A paper describes a structure:
The N-terminal domain is commonly referred to as conserved domain-1, or [name]-domain, and the C-terminal domain as conserved domain-2, or helicase domain.
[name] ([name]) is essential for translation initiation. It is part of the eIF4F complex that consists of eIF4G, eIF4E and [name]. The eIF4F complex and [name] are potential targets for anti cancer drugs. Motifs Ia, Ib and II seem unaffected by the state of ATP hydrolysis, and their conformations remain unchanged even in the crystal structures in which the nucleotide binding site is not occupied. In all single [name]-domain structures, α-helix 8 has adopted a position that would block the RNA binding site.
Numbering used by the authors: 21 to 136, 139 to 238
Write the structure that this text describes.
Amino acid sequence: GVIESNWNEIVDSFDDMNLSESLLRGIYAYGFEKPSAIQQRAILPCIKGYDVIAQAQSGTGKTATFAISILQQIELDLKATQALVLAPTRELAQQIQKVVMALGDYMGASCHACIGNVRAEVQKLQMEAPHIIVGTPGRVFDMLNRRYLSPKYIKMFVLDEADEMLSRGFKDQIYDIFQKLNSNTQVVLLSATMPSDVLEVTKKFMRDPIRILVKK
């Protein structure tokens, strides 16, 4: 489905995004060069704290867009979970974790994956509360529900591939997680398609959002 863009800024260089020096070092050590259209448009309003709706296809640079925005906002000495990322699958959740960790490794920002027969992961969380959790909706709601994860400091909530998550039956978990977050929480939703039930999430959970369409 199709949204209309509404934001002004475009930034063609990661040098120009006001990133912390070691975040930038981390981005370049990883092998990113110049920002793609999504990164040029969306990184700055995400870091500014605005609700963002980004419609962009796969292969366009989304992961790095929110990985970078999230890492820039982290209060590094606040040993607490500060940002939550939802993905429709475990492999996509792990891939997101491996970008965030590889950039965060230059700043000392921690990131844990929260996925579905090993539940020793549900203990070990009791070294650090990680700064960033990435997970699938059932698993993340489980940890909120049973209080292994605290919503108290979560002040960034990212929904990657929102359409896929709805298609996979995750609307109750997502809404339940929404209800458990602080009313003040920044929401970033990314999706290739924007059908009405995706849009309804944006209507229930976002306020005066930034709208970015990257055309395929």
